[PDB]
Amino acid sequence: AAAIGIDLGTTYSCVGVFQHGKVEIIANDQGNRTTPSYVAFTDTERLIGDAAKNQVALNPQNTVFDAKRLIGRKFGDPVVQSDMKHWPFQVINDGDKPKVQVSYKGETKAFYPEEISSMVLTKMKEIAEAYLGYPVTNAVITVPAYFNDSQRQATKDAGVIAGLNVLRIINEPTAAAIAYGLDRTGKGERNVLIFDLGGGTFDVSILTIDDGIFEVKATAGDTHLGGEDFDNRLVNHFVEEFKRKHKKDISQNKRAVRRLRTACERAKRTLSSSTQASLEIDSLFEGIDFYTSITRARFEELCSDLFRSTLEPVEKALRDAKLDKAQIHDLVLVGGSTRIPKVQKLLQDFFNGRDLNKSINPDEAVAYGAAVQAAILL
Numbered sequence: 001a002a003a004i005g006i007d008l009g010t011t012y013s014c015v016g017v018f019q020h021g022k023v024e025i026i027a028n029d030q031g032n033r034t035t036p037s038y039v040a041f042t043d044t045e046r047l048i049g050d051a052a053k054n055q056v057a058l059n060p061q062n063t064v065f066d067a068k069r070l071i072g073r074k075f076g077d078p079v080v081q082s083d084m085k086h087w088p089f090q091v092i093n094d095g096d097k098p099k100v101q102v103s104y105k106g107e108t109k110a111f112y113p114e115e116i117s118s119m120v121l122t123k124m125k126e127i128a129e130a131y132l133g134y135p136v137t138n139a140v141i142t143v144p145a146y147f148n149d150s151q152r153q154a155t156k157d158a159g160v161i162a163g164l165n166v167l168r169i170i171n172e173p174t175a176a177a178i179a180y181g182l183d184r185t186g187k188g189e190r191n192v193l194i195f196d197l198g199g200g201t202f203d204v205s206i207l208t209i210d211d212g213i214f215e216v217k218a219t220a221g222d223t224h225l226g227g228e229d230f231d232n233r234l235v236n237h238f239v240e241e242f243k244r245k246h247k248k249d250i251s252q253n254k255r256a257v258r259r260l261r262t263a264c265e266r267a268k269r270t271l272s273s274s275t276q277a278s279l280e281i282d283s284l285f286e287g288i289d290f291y292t293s294i295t296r297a298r299f300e301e302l303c304s305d306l307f308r309s310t311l312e313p314v315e316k317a318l319r320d321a322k323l324d325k326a327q328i329h330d331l332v333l334v335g336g337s338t339r340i341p342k343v344q345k346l347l348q349d350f351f352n353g354r355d356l357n358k359s360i361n362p363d364e365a366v367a368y369g370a371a372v373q374a375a376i377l378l
């Protein structure tokens with residue numbers, strides 16, 4: 001019975017399995033190799049993953065996401081108080097622990113963050129079981145390197161609730177290094193920089209590896225910079241373009257904006273491989289169809305300040321680790337947003353033309369390494 005490796009992401013989760021000498025990343029019901037970390041409650045159903053994200057415009061108060069920002073924290077934690085103000089769902093205090101309160105099957109219900117995350121883990125477990133054809137019970141789950149003991153415990157608890165035997169909780173940047181075989185060095189210190197630009201967060205880690213032992217030397221980043229911010233820059237551009245062309249301001253209509261945001265996230269992905277993308281949304285606002293386009297160059301201009309800002313935490317991490325650029329042996333790209341060509345150019349230029357490790361889809365690298373580690377531990 002194969003053990004699985006699970007990246008339980010802030011915005012997207014991913015599951016892999018090591019089998020027959022190789023890692024397979026497992027696609028879900030809709031054919032997608034990553035799954036949104038969303039759960040929604042309706043009058044009749046609990047929806048998890050793609051199905052939950054796909055109805056967020058319809059049902060915002062009862063569609064939960066960002067549980068990883070709450071997990072293992074206390075209600076009065078300044079991070080929780082601050083993050084709350086930008087979620088459409090209600091967070092309440094039950095004994096200084098946060099709970100999310102929703103309507104389900106006509107009743108008010110409340111769940112701890114680890115219960116919400118357990119629902120995402122259940123889906124990841126089910127996706128794996130459908131592919132393997134038998135039940136899976138053992139898993140490695142990853143967490144950010146900066147998670148404390150309470151956040152690690154709560155993550156393990158989420159796995160227990162989902163029916164998993166959690167073999168180990170390992171750090172995300174460590175998992176990514178393992179995916180590339182960087183744990184095998186021989187004697188001698190190797191310094192690895194993991195540049196992880198995901199959907200909601202930006203993490204830079206410098207690892208030193210010595211005889212297969214990992215040390216985290218420095219971490220930096222920004223817990224509120226990621227792909228979602230690039231989507232919002234596109235949204236704002238198109239709200240303005242709609243206002244010009246149709247002299248109407250859609251910004252007040254929450255449903256129109258959410259539908260526009262969905263379309264922008266899709267166009268953004270297209271711009272990683274093409275130089276132009278089309279947007280076609282029927283009946284966006286008061287019956288008006290919005291059919292337009294955007295070039296890669298314009299997208300890069302709209303986000304240029306955000307892209308450039310990713311280099312300051314790199315500089316900071318190097319300083320805290322007391323390392324020069326030349327002393328970094330390997331650069332590893334992690335996170336879906338590192339597929340953006342301008343982000344790759346900025347990092348490569350900053351490192352004076354060095355190669356980037358990017359042969360493993362960056363949004364899959366953490367699950368990949370977790371899967372390798374799971375098989376070892378079994």
Ligand SMILES: Nc1ncnc2c1ncn2[C@@H]1O[C@H](COP(=O)(O)OP(=O)(O)O)[C@@H](O)[C@H]1O
Pocket residue numbers: 009010011012013034197198199200201226227228265268269270272334335336337338339340362363
């Ligand atoms: N081809 C692509 N081009 C640009 N951004 C992408 C692409 N594919 C995925 N993304 C972005 O990656 C982000 C999710 O990153 P990921 O690493 O999968 O999640 P997490 O940060 O939750 O671990 C989303 O913002 C998504 O739009």
Ligand SMILES: [Mg+2]
Pocket residue numbers: 009010198335366
């Ligand atoms: Mg991630």
Ligand code: NA
Pocket residue numbers: 007008009010011012013014363
């Ligand atoms: Na992820």
